[PDB]
Design a binder for these strands. Sequence first.
RNA 1: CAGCCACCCGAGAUUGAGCAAUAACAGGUCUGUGAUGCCCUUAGAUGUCCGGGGCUGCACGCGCGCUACACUGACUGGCUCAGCGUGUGCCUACCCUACGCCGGCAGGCGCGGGUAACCCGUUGAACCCCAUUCGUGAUGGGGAUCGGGGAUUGCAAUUAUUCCCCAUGAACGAGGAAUUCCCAGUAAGUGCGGGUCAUAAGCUUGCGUUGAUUAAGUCCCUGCCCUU
RNA 2: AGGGCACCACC
Lengths: 141, 71, 140, 184, 140, 124, 100, 55
Amino acid sequence: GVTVKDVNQQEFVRALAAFLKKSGKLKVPEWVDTVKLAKHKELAPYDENWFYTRAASTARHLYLRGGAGVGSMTKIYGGRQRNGVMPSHFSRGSKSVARRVLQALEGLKMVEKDQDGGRKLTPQGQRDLDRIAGQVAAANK
Amino acid sequence: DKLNNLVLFDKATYDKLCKEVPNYKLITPAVVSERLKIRGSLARAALQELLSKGLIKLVSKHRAQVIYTRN
Amino acid sequence: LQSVQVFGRKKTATAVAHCKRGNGLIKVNGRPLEMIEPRTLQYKLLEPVLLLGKERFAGVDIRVRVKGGGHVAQIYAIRQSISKALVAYYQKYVDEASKKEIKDILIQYDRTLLVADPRRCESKKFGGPGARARYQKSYR
Amino acid sequence: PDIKLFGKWSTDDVQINDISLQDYIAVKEKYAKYLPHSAGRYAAKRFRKAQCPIVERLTNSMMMHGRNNGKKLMTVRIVKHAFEIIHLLTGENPLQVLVNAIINSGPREDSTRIRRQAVDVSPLRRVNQAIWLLCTGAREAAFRNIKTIAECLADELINAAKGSSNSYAIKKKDELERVAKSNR
Amino acid sequence: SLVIPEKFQHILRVLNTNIDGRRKIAFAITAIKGVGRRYAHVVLRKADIDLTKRAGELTEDEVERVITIMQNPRQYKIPDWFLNRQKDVKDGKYSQVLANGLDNKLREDLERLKKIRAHRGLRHFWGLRVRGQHTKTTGR
Amino acid sequence: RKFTYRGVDLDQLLDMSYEQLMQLYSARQRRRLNRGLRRKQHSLLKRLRKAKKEAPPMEKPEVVKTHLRDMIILPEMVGSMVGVYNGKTFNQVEIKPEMIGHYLGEFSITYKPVKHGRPGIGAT
Amino acid sequence: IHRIRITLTSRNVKSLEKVCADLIRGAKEKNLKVKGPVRMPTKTLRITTRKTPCGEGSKTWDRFQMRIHKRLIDLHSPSEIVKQITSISIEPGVEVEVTI
Amino acid sequence: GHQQLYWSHPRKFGQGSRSCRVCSNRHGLIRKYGLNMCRQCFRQYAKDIGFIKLD
RNA sequence: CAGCCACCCGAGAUUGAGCAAUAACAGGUCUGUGAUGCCCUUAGAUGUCCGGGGCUGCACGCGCGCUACACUGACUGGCUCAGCGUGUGCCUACCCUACGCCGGCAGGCGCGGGUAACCCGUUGAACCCCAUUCGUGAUGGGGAUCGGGGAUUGCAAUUAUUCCCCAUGAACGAGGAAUUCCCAGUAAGUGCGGGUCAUAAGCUUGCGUUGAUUAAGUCCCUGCCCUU
RNA sequence: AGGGCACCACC
Ligand SMILES: [K+]
Ligand SMILES: [K+]
Ligand SMILES: [K+]
Ligand SMILES: [K+]
Ligand SMILES: [K+]
Ligand SMILES: [K+]
Ligand SMILES: [Mg+2]
Ligand SMILES: [Mg+2]
Ligand SMILES: [Mg+2]
Ligand SMILES: [Mg+2]
Ligand SMILES: [Mg+2]
Ligand SMILES: [Mg+2]
Ligand SMILES: [Mg+2]
Ligand SMILES: [Mg+2]
Ligand SMILES: [Mg+2]
Ligand SMILES: [Mg+2]
Ligand SMILES: [Zn+2]
């Protein structure tokens, strides 16, 4: 038996992103090639398929900690903003990106809206993530 | 004076790489760049190609330092 | 039902290890001990097991819950809590001789494995950026 | 269970040739640790730093200048990679190379400038100044150069252990001792 | 793959600008005034050009396609908010002004502000700061 | 050739209402017009219209003086003569079409440009 | 009967503890199931201000602070009995809020 | 008329809308916890209010 | 003797502050005060309100600072950890915000919780850690200056309030004489609160996080003090 | 002339 917490999280995220891309049923916004992921970024993501990686990361976060909304996701993906000759400060991520990722995951039926607000994993999503974790553990061993 | 490194191998530099480099005790992108007058990106790509072909051996990989050695 | 709950501290980081009769499991926040980040300091976590041997831990399951502080402080809190939990379990459900010998090994290697470091941040004082440094003084 | 630094380098075979520095280079037995990161209170009392493992003292001295202050995880990684490079380049124990470098880099006579007068140098100051010179040489070699800091540190340590004049620490020690001889 | 091709171009001329062929393509077309890193990356994404190749490695057809997309962003779904000349005060059209076009636009804007004797135009004419900065101590 | 603001000639601008002009204006002027002009601005507009009507043919209208330095220059104001207060004096400004969208204050400078004299005692 | 919650708040720890002890002793005498005094975290209101009325001299600061201490007591008793118990002498400076 | 002009400048925010509840001065005002007192008046009345220098 | 040094045991063998004498200074403050003497002014006002401008004005000199000069780095992803504390108000307008939807962003709309160990909030902070691209080039270092556009606060944003987007891409390659602060969870790095606050931090006052080198001395310099 | 003290002194 293998669960997510048993494996390396970076390898798990890569494997889950590959799985989502291979399934190919995840809805991708038309503007993924134009936007940057936050106002504190300077450039758009280097990886062309950054949307699948972000979706996998969001699903893993929902597995670890359910009930997170778009605000929580933007807090999760926030980072340091450099302000030129002024000091740096914390800045949040793109609400549209977080919302589209959550809606796409809901479209895949791996994510459902929680009763108390926010999103959570469906049993199907939990099963998919545990299977991916088992594959990662098998690959490592 | 400013050092003008090569972004892509010429025939002589590529031959010198494939001949001498797999014989060094310490193989790093920085030392290869210094010896062959190539850029760090070209050195990293060349060392990855040599590792794929099996001419050299990987000692350690890290985001800031990658260390290879001869077989 | 044999179990102990023992804490370890480092700055504001606190880790509580629940050590009960078991088969040799060690978890931190539900994750394997080898998966805790940063892995630059993985040997700091592995030190109790490396020093005492896996045979001592083979009879217990230890689950560690850690919170507060930073990454390094949490690492040190986890290792201290694991060591103190094993010592407490031995002194409670085994003889005193085994507890004494494992405690001697741990103390000889590193006292902070069993005794907490009492250092804490010093308060800032007005007239300077921190506890001791003062703002630059000009004359003319 | 033998304890090896980073799980790779053993301390049993390390020899300190200079008997004056044997009490101020903590490298083996009770001073053998898995990592050069102990978070110990070695600065609490005088001479207590003599108990700090020499690898950890090197790691501490690598946290300069200001931009690198407090980045001990980064300096630990730098030291680990430097030891790997040293082992590849020499085939020796990196701990032995470090010990030889420190022994060769410590200045034995200095001048106090009270016109200057020559004075001897205590073993603890010898070790302190050797570490300082080695780290300074590595840092200045790595600044504004494609060569990485780990490679520069490895080269500096190897040259100092050999006693070569390519070493910044060796050159500085020679200059200090020459000035002390002149003011003698 | 790593050997330099025979068709590799050391220097390219695009829009009366010398583009260095040794640089990666995205940071090589930034030599054109009016093209920054963001705009260069979005243009190359629209042009389906691999970002990993150098400027000299591009074929003539690829270079022509890149120039066409660069000079007509709106036809390739490059959004208006990405443009450095949005809702031009004279024409109302959205465009990306490049090189001599950008210089002419700047001169025209300054000339208009000076012609109506607006305060910002007068500040530009006098050579002072125009965005409300203090001039007592800085800008010397 | 002929004047155009956002590609619209002056006559079409005069025809357009406030809601149509808001889309042509920049963000600041659009927000200002959305929040709405007040009694003082309406009084100034009425004064300008009266001056335009009373102006003899082929002659500039009489100068209308005002303190309203934060008045948006609307198309209907083009051709008027406005004495904009600068804190001390009513500087005379003729509204040009290219002034559309700016503030009247931008054409009535509140300070004298600095011509420096010799530094005083000290001032090392 | 009804569940009664008594919230006591004070700036004086000693008087607050005396009142809480007296209330619990009264509840014990009346033979009531009383949950002990739950101690909320102490609130520290701080005002840091320059000492000088003007702007001259070394920049020294006064650190004024006020400490507010809060206690909770739970009872299972009739409202009349709770009011009778709370009718005992209350030390000055203690604010009592009873909720049913 | 004068009724419409007098005191007609809006004072819903800014320094001109606040003053010390003791001396009516508008500078160095403390609004924290709703004190609304200038700093000097606060130092005068801090012990009466209940603020002490433990430190 | 007073006490000093080292060591054992021990959580700890010198935690950090507050308070703080006699006698003084023509030190600062009458621009904190319905504290105040005297003098001045008091209806064409030095009262008071309203409108506009100024306090920010720029050949220059000085002081406190912020950002940097890069690879012990920048960028793009991924992963994973705090503490102090504030929050809907007499006048008084102005609170902290979860979740859902719209927008690329700043933001907008809806709908809830919290007068608070109850809700924001398990305060998913930054540095750091793991991968990526860059490759010694004033360069993907740096981000000044400047053009165009979009929002928000406000009665009002021009002399740009603040914020966002594209573009522009200056000096600066480690700093002369001189000089500041500091010895342990300290210096330094790093972010987060409070005050100011309609709008709001390059300041200050606190908080944690990472975390050292050197020293356990002296009267040489700068001062202060004592005795003859 | 001698003797103390202080990282708002130095080493
Ligand atoms: K380097
Ligand atoms: K006074
Ligand atoms: K007076
Ligand atoms: K007065
Ligand atoms: K004043
Ligand atoms: K005041
Ligand atoms: Mg983040
Ligand atoms: Mg600090
Ligand atoms: Mg460009
Ligand atoms: Mg005086
Ligand atoms: Mg001023
Ligand atoms: Mg940059
Ligand atoms: Mg540049
Ligand atoms: Mg201030
Ligand atoms: Mg001084
Ligand atoms: Mg000095
Ligand atoms: Zn007052």
